[PDB]
Design a protein around this ligand. Structure first.
Ligand code: HEM
Length: 184
């Protein structure tokens, strides 16, 4: 179950965040800790494609090799707060699991600048959810979390020390697929 109404960044700059480029997850915190593995790789692209607000997601479990991509049309709830559908696709955008009622995530940008961000998501997939999930993002897949984003974690009344890093998993991404998936 999700429990947090995440507050979007004051003065969030949507066009900068949704610029078509890739964001890498460097650290994450699930409030239901057993909802997700302790080793994981994730990234997304975010942009407007032919007037439509889009995200493309990538998930990879570096131990099991479980891999999946998704394409998401985002609807606006308020500035920096979205409800995303999702269809599971291969890396080329071919549909594996169509959009359906009941499969959606919320997505809140709590903090962002040109290089870093803090987001919250609540996944609903069936009558189930994947509890509250916070993620620290960077444009540079190898970047240690800096002071702007760590301060934002504190301002959310969270402890960065509890976040799990993705950096020791040999994560390798297909940026080209993420960018192209925005159009799909
Ligand atoms: C970057 C922000 C993220 C978003 C928006 C997001 C969104 C999603 C979505 C939409 C799905 C379902 C995909 C499908 O069935 O087609 C999913 C599944 C999953 N995500 Fe994330 N995710 C994010 C990051 C993460 C991170 C950092 C982890 C940490 C391990 C994670 C763990 C999982 C797991 C384990 C599943 C499979 C759930 C299941 O079907 O049992 N995700 N995520």
């Amino acid at each position: 179950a999700c429990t947090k109404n995440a507050i979007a960044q004051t003065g969030f700059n949507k066009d900068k965040y949704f610029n078509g480029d890739v964001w890498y997850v460097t650290d994450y915190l699930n409030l239901e800790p057993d909802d997700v593995p302790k080793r994981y790789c994730a990234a997304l692209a975010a942009g407007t494609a032919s007037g439509k607000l889009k995200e493309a997601l990538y998930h990879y479990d570096p131990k099991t090799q479980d891999t999946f991509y998704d394409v998401s049309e985002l609807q606006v709830e308020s500035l920096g707060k979205y409800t995303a559908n999702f269809k599971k696709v291969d890396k080329n955008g071919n549909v594996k699991v169509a959009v359906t009622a009941g499969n959606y995530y919320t997505f809140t940008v709590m903090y962002a600048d040109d290089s870093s961000a803090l987001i919250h998501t609540c996944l609903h997939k069936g009558n189930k959810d994947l509890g509250d999930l916070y993620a620290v993002l960077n444009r540079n897949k190898d970047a240690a979390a800096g002071d702007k984003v760590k301060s934002a974690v504190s301002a959310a009344t969270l402890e960065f020390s509890k976040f799990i890093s993705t950096k020791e998993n040999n994560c390798a991404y297909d940026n080209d697929s993420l960018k192209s998936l925005l159009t799909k």
